[PDB]
């Protein structure tokens, strides 16, 4: 179970990004990069800013 909470809305601005809404619980796919985390939201995968999510533990 690897979940993150969206702390802010984020609208995708480049091809491999995804959009999320504040309060969404996203599945974390890859957190190897310090700035951009790969997540799954609404049937879609892609990157959001690491700073805009909180790892749930």
User: What single-letter DSSP state applies at residue 8?
Assistant: S
> Could you tell me the domains of the chain?
1-57 (2.30.30.40)
Burial of residue 4, with CB atoms counted within 10 A of its CB: 0-12 exposed, 13-18 middle, 19 or more buried: buried
Q: How was this structure determined?
A: X-ray
Q: Edge-to-edge strand order for the sheet containing 36-41?
A: 44-49, 36-41, 25-30, 3-6, 53-55
Q: Which residue, among 56, 26, 2, 3, has the nearest Cα to 48 in the 3D structure?
A: 26
Say how far apart CA 18 and CA 49 lie, in whole Å.
10
Q: State in Å, rounded, how far the first CA of the chain is from the last one.
A: 10
Classify residue 16 by its DSSP letter. Answer: T
**CB-neighbour burial class of residue 48 (10 A; exposed 0-12, middle 13-18, buried 19+):** buried
Q: Which residue, 22, 17, 23, 21, is CA-closest to 39?
A: 17
**SS3 sequence, the chain?**
CCEEEECCCECCCCCCECCECCCCEEEEEECCCCCEEEEEECCEEEEEEHHHEEECC
């Amino acid at each position: 179970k690897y979940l993150v909470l969206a702390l802010y809305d984020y609208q995708e601005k480049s091809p491999r990004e995804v959009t999320m809404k504040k309060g969404d619980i996203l599945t974390l796919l890859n957190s190897t990069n310090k700035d951009w985390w790969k997540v799954e939201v609404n049937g879609r995968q892609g990157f959001v800013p690491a700073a805009y999510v909180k790892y749930l533990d």
